[PDB]
């Protein structure tokens, strides 16, 4: 019985989407804030610097019209956010999971475990229960519901699925990360300009992977191997990155120190993960980086001395989807595999053998996952 | 069968808020402090409910001073999530820390040896979570591998065992601190004649935290295993969400629990027992020691009657219900501790009342059922 493998990846987004170039006009128009000219220009500059071209969003103009409190900055809004998310998040997860199961090509009743991960709404029973119902799985699927984790949680889910797959003979784990900015969408406010950053960053999406050890020959086709997974955090990280669930929905606290602190700390995580494997040249790896913002992508690239194309897949996902929180890295996994096929390369990791997936989030938590590629 | 083998419970500790209220005097307290003494018939109905809970006292994070300073907590529906969060986001990690200190004290190994932390609660959420805060409070290092289990519910004690088993068995040398910390402050609210069923919740739930140390391959002469986690399986009764559900709203945590719940649970526990214990060749439920989640006294009685258990099998369960009320996911861990302590008091030879195999059964939202087969250890 050997290492946990990624056996399939699927993704899904809400049909509704908005291009970033026209997003300042849409945002200030639909929140009835067009009289705030200077704030609107600042938001234009922020959106132009995000390096995001479009984002998919569960919230439509129609939903904003039916619920004007969503367009305020602080009015009570958690109840409508919950009414939307408790229903929509399992459905988006279901779409991603169906695509993953189709690639996997095994019967869905063979799934033994489900791990569902989100920070967009909570409920009891959780989204895992709803997804079991929506997918037509049996009640004997072993569920784990990971609520309110954040951006770093893609790495966390890989870390968890590794143990689930390697310690249970024959286990097949459906892992789903589903996120929506509807939990934190709110109108602009000159008293709280930094929140504009969040309103420019976050998009909606779900990713699903199938994880398992001991692949069936001629039936399953491994995509990646989860070699190792480790978490840490930068002390006092909660003073720099934190999000609270309030009557106004999810709040956002992110100091300017965050990108340089993360970039400052990633090399020790890389060393701790890769020295036991005898790897020290970070450009000998393929890369998956959580694109918390374009600044962090650039600063990790510069601090580590990575060739500019290493983070191409990361940038692609940012460009096409924005920050989808824990789902991002999984999207990027798919992209780096798809890109590898388009370039005619021989492995799922851009022709390289070893790679690293690095994610980060609230508390300056950092997840480091070492991956091994597979034949394309 | 191996020593690099199954996950073991190596220590159990518990903690409760200092403030407590007797159940006999709780109707008077509840209707006085929520300014509802004009609701005489509702108060009498609440008296009957509290009399049937079989609870003697509950420990509470909410004091009279906190309730008076925040009248929205004493209403039924006014916006209250923010004050509940301000209380819980701070208090739940502290209570978890107290339980963890007790568990580490029994464990008697240096806390820096803990490699994993699993934190479990349904009382408030935050990012970063209560696990992060507990790392800070306990003085552990940032390299402890954390898993934060928010908004799980009553059954999650079983879930945590199910999780720790894998963490311990797939990571050589790993030592996992598991913490379940719960407070009824997330769902406390004033009474309402339009919503009489909520009175049930107001009579049931108490506050408390439990902590265990879980690990494989115990160190000889240093660690003293308490229980062995033989197996762990989850299921649910189809359409269970229609019978038991709780939603987090601007008014805090709501409560939906039909009268069908105890009979449906009792009806379904035997198939879980059979599925878990037939591979071990066990079919006599009275040959086991028992840990049952006391979601209510009715469920305890109906499981006893449906399975034909000797009346003393659920004594530890009833003891914890009596002395603490329903502490949600923490309950079963409390009961684990109690069944071990009781075994010492009665002079029995194993931590499971002198028996070899036992079962821990918990249940919660969605009619989810967790079934954990346990093996005792020499006392
Ligand atoms: C998700 C997560 O974990 C939780 C979850 O959702 O589940 C995450 O990953 S969140 C982590 C995201 N972090 C960031 O995006 C870091 C934010 N960026 C910064 O702090 C930096 O200061 C930048 C380098 C991005 C700012 O410079 P940039 O190169 O982008 O553009 P410049 O011209 O400065 O900036 C344009 C305007 O942006 C304003 N601004 C940037 N960042 C902030 C923050 N953090 N707070 C408030 N304002 C910010 C700049 O002031 C600048 O203003 P201007 O009006 O032109 O003077
Ligand atoms: C009826 C009986 C109580 C067995 O009988 P009893 O001996 O216990 O008392 P009783 O004779 O019913 O008298 C009590 C008075 O209350 C009324 N009444 C009772 N029950 C309900 C109810 N359900 N709805 C509405 N009205 C109810 C009843 O009509 C009567 O009114 P009156 O007759 O005075 O008019 C039992 O079937 C039952 O439903 N028990 C509920 C206990 C229970 O299941 N708790 C689950 C907790 S879930 C958990 O653990 C946590 C999590 O999962 C998640 C998390 O928190 O994280």
Query: How would you write chain A as a 3-class SS string?
Result: CCCCEEEEEEEECCCCEEECCCHHHHHHHHCCCCCCHHHHHHHHHHHHHCCCCEEECCCCHHHHHHCHHHHCCCCCCHHHHHHHHHHHHHHHHHHHHHHHHHHHCCCHHHCCEEEEEECCCCCECCHHHHHHHHHCCCCCCEEEEEECCCCCHHHHHHHHHHHHHHCCCCCEEEEEEEECHHHCCCCCCCCCCCHHHHHHHECCEEEEEEEECCCCCCCCCCCEEEEEEEEEECCCHHHCEEECEECCEECCEECCCHHHHHHHHHHHHHHHHHHHHCCCCHHHCEEEECCCCHHHHHHHHHHHCCCCCCCHHHHHHHHHHCECCCHHHHHHHHHHHHHHHHCCCCECCCCCCEEEEEEEEHHHEEEEEEEEECEC
CA B37 vs. chain centroid, Å, equals 32
Which range marks the domain in which residue A353 is found?
223-376
Residue whose CA is closest, atom 5 of ligand 2? B298
Measured distance CA(A17)–CA(A205) in Å, rounded? 11
Cα→Cα distances B141→A263, A286, B136, B146, Å:
20, 30, 8, 11
In the numeric block, which tokens belong to residue A12? Answer: 């899904």
Task: Tell me how long chain B is.
Answer: 379
Measured distance CA(B211)–CA(A330) in Å, rounded? 33
What are the φ/ψ torsions at residue B154 (nearest 5 degrees)?
A: -60, -30
Find the ligand nearest to B365 CA. 2
What CATH number should be reported for the domain holding residue A191?
A: 3.40.47.10
Catalytic residues of A: 151
Give the list of residues 6+ apart from residue B65 with CB closer than 8 angstroms, or none: none
Measured distance CA(A113)–CA(A171) in Å, rounded? 7
Residues A218 and A305 in one domain: no
A292 in contact with chain B, both atoms CB, cutoff 8 A: no
Q: How far away is chain A from the Cα of B66, in angstroms, using its nearest Cα?
A: 19
Tell me the chain A residues in contact with residue B237 when contact means C-beta distances shorter than 8 Å: 139
Residues A264 and A356 in one domain: yes
Residues B49 and B78 in one domain: yes
Name the one residue in this structure whose structure tokens are 């003085």: B139
Find the ligand nearest to B241 CA. 2
Nearest-atom number in ligand 1 for the CA of A326 is: 7
Look at residue B196 and give its three-state secondary structure.
Answer: coil
The total number of structural domains that make up chain A: 2
Q: Which residue, A372, A312, A304, is CA-closest to A342?
A: A312
Q: How far away is chain A from the Cα of B229, in angstroms, using its nearest Cα?
A: 14
Residues A191 and A97 in one domain: yes
Residues B209 and B353 in one domain: no
How was this entry determined? X-ray
Asked if omega into A310 is within 30° of 0 (cis), the reply is: no
Measured distance CA(A270)–CA(A369) in Å, rounded? 9
Residues B220 and B232 in one domain: no
Q: How far is the CA of B260 from the centre of ligand 2 (A)?
A: 10
In the numeric block, which tokens belong to residue A374? Answer: 């597979």
Q: What residue ranges line ligand 1, CB within 6 angstroms?
A: A 42, 45-46, 49, 119, 150-151, 194, 197, 243, 254, 256, 258-259, 292-293, 295, 323, 325, 361-362
- HSE value, Cβ hemisphere, 13 Å, CA-based, for A7: 29
Q: Which residue, B94, B93, B149, B82, is CA-closest to A251?
A: B82
Task: Tell me how long chain A is.
Answer: 376
Look at residue B264 and give its three-state secondary structure.
Answer: helix
Tell me the chain B residues in contact with residue A122 when contact means C-beta distances shorter than 8 Å: 125, 150-151, 248
Residues A149 and A215 in one domain: yes
Asked if omega into B127 is within 30° of 0 (cis), the reply is: no
Give the end-to-end CA distance of chain B in Å, rounded to a whole number: 20
For chain B, strand residue ranges (E) read 8-15, 20-22, 57-59, 116-121, 145-150, 175-182, 208-215, 227-236, 244-245, 248-249, 252-253, 256-257, 289-292, 357-364, 368-376
Contact B377, B226 (CB under 8 A): yes
Name the one residue in this structure whose structure tokens are 């997918």: A135
Give the list of residues 6+ apart from residue A276 with CB closer than 8 angstroms, or none: none
- HSE value, Cβ hemisphere, 13 Å, CA-based, for A237: 27
Measured distance CA(A237)–CA(A220) in Å, rounded? 41
Q: Which residue, B299, B258, B316, B16, is CA-closest to B155?
A: B299
Give the list of residues 6+ apart from residue A288 with CB closer than 8 angstroms, or none: A313, A314, A329, A332, A333, A336, A355, A356, A357, A358, A371
Q: How far away is chain B from the Cα of A244, in angstroms, using its nearest Cα?
A: 5
Measured distance CA(B119)–CA(B100) in Å, rounded? 11
Resolution in A: 2.5
Measured distance CA(B332)–CA(B325) in Å, rounded? 12
Contact B177, B148 (CB under 8 A): no
Q: Which residue, B290, B322, B320, is CA-closest to B304?
A: B290
Q: Chain A, 205-244: which have a CB under 8 Å from a chain B CB?
A: 230-235, 237-238, 242-244
What are the φ/ψ torsions at residue B12 (nearest 5 degrees)?
A: -135, 135
CB spacing of A125 vs B240 below 8 angstroms: yes
Give the list of residues 6+ apart from residue A83 with CB closer than 8 angstroms, or none: none
Q: How many CB pairs under 8 A join A and B?
A: 144
Last residue of a domain, one of A222, A252, A284: A222
Residues B233 and B323 in one domain: yes
Q: Which conformational region is residue A281 in: left (phi greater than 0), alpha (psi within -120 to 50 degrees), or beta?
A: beta
Q: Which residue, A121, A173, A180, A174, is CA-closest to A147?
A: A121
Residues B265 and B203 in one domain: no
Catalytic residue among B50, B74, B120, B154: B154
Q: How far is the CA of A256 from the centre of ligand 1 (A)?
A: 6
CB spacing of A156 vs B167 below 8 angstroms: no
Q: Which residues does a gap of C–N over 2.5 Å follow in chain B?
A: none
Give the end-to-end CA distance of chain A in Å, rounded to a whole number: 23
In the numeric block, which tokens belong to residue A226? Answer: 């989860």
Q: Which conformational region is residue A351 in: left (phi greater than 0), alpha (psi within -120 to 50 degrees), or beta?
A: left
CB spacing of A167 vs B163 below 8 angstroms: no
Tell me the chain B residues in contact with residue A146 when contact means C-beta distances shorter than 8 Å: 147-149
A148 vs B150, B170, B171: nearest CB: B150
Measured distance CA(B181)–CA(A135) in Å, rounded? 32
Residues A358 and A235 in one domain: yes
Cα→Cα distances B316→B139, B143, B236, B337, B339, Å:
33, 37, 25, 9, 5
A247 vs B81, B167, B237: nearest CB: B81
Q: How far is the CA of B321 from the centre of ligand 2 (A)?
A: 15
Measured distance CA(B211)–CA(B159) in Å, rounded? 14
Please, what is the Cα angle at B135 between B132 and B139, to 5 degrees?
A: 150
Closest-CA residue of B relative to A361 is B128
Last residue of a domain, one of B225, B256, B290: B225
Look at residue B90 and give its three-state secondary structure.
Answer: helix
- Residue B141's CB is within 10 A of a number of other CB atoms, namely 13
Tell me the chain A residues in contact with residue B236 when contact means C-beta distances shorter than 8 Å: 125, 129, 139
CB spacing of A245 vs B85 below 8 angstroms: yes
Tell me the chain A residues in contact with residue B127 when contact means C-beta distances shorter than 8 Å: 119, 148-150, 242-245, 361-363
Q: What residue ranges line ligand 2, CB within 6 angstroms?
A: B 45, 48-49, 52, 122, 153-154, 197, 200, 204, 246, 257, 259, 261-262, 295-299, 326, 328, 364-365
Cα→Cα distances A207→A34, A55, B211, B303, Å:
36, 15, 34, 41
Q: A286-289 and A354-361: which strand pairing?
A: parallel
Rg of chain B, C-alpha, whole Å = 20
Q: Which conformational region is residue B98 in: left (phi greater than 0), alpha (psi within -120 to 50 degrees), or beta?
A: alpha
- HSE value, Cβ hemisphere, 13 Å, CA-based, for A249: 25
Residue whose CA is closest, atom 14 of ligand 1? A293
Residues A203 and A242 in one domain: no
Measured distance CA(A267)–CA(A299) in Å, rounded? 12
B127 vs A123, A124, A148: nearest CB: A148
Q: Which residue, B234, B298, B304, is CA-closest to B260?
A: B298
Q: Chain B, 240-279: which have a CB under 8 Å from a chain A CB?
A: 240-241, 245-250
Contact B375, B358 (CB under 8 A): yes
Look at residue B140 and give its three-state secondary structure.
Answer: coil
Last residue of a domain, one of A179, A200, A222: A222
Name the one residue in this structure whose structure tokens are 């649970």: B265
Contact A195, A316 (CB under 8 A): no
CB spacing of A363 vs B127 below 8 angstroms: yes
Residues B374 and B232 in one domain: yes
Q: A54-56 and B244-245: which strand pairing?
A: unpaired
Name the one residue in this structure whose structure tokens are 């301000």: B86
Measured distance CA(B98)–CA(B120) in Å, rounded? 15
């Amino acid at each position: 019985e050997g290492p946990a493998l990624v056996l399939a990846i699927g993704t899904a987004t809400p049909s509704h989407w908005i291009d970033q170039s026209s997003y300042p006009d849409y945002y200030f128009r639909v929140t009835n804030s067009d009289h705030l000219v200077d704030l609107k220009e600042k938001f234009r500059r922020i959106c132009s610097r995000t390096m995001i071209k479009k984002r998919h969003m569960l919230l439509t103009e129609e939903i904003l019209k039916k619920n004007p409190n969503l367009c305020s900055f602080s009015e009570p809004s958690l109840d409508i956010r919950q009414d939307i998310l408790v229903s929509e998040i399992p459905k988006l997860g279901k779409e991603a999971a169906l695509k993953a199961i189709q690639e996997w090509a095994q019967p869905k009743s063979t799934i033994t475990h489900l791990v569902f991960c989100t920070r967009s709404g909570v409920d009891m029973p959780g989204a895992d229960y709803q997804l079991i119902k929506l997918l037509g799985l049996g009640p004997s699927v072993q569920r784990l519901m990971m609520y309110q984790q954040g951006c770093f949680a893609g790495g966390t889910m890989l870390r968890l699925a590794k143990d689930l797959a390697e310690n249970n003979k024959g286990a097949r784990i459906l892992v789903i990360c589903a996120e929506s900015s509807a939990i934190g969408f709110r109108g602009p406010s000159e008293s709280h300009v930094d929140n504009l950053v969040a309103q420019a960053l976050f998009g909606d999406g779900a990713a699903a992977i199938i994880v398992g050890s001991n692949p069936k020959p001629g039936l399953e086709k491994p995509v990646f191997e989860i070699v190792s997974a480790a978490q840490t955090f930068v002390p006092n990280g909660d003073c720099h990155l934190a999000l609270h669930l309030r009557e106004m929905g999810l709040t956002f606290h992110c100091t300017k120190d965050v990108p340089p602190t993360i970039a400052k700390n990633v090399e020790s995580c890389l060393t701790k993960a890769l020295e036991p494997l005898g790897i020290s040249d970070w450009n000998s790896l393929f890369w998956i980086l959580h694109p918390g913002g374009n600044a962090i992508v650039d600063q990790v690239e510069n601090k580590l001395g990575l060739e500019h194309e290493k983070l191409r897949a990361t940038r692609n996902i940012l460009r096409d989807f924005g920050n989808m929180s824990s789902a991002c890295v999984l999207f990027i996994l798919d992209e780096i595999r798809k890109k590898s096929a388009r370039d005619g390369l021989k492995t799922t990791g851009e022709g390289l053998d070893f790679g690293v997936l690095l994610s980060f989030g609230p508390g300056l938590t950092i997840e480091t996952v070492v991956l091994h590629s597979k034949p394309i």
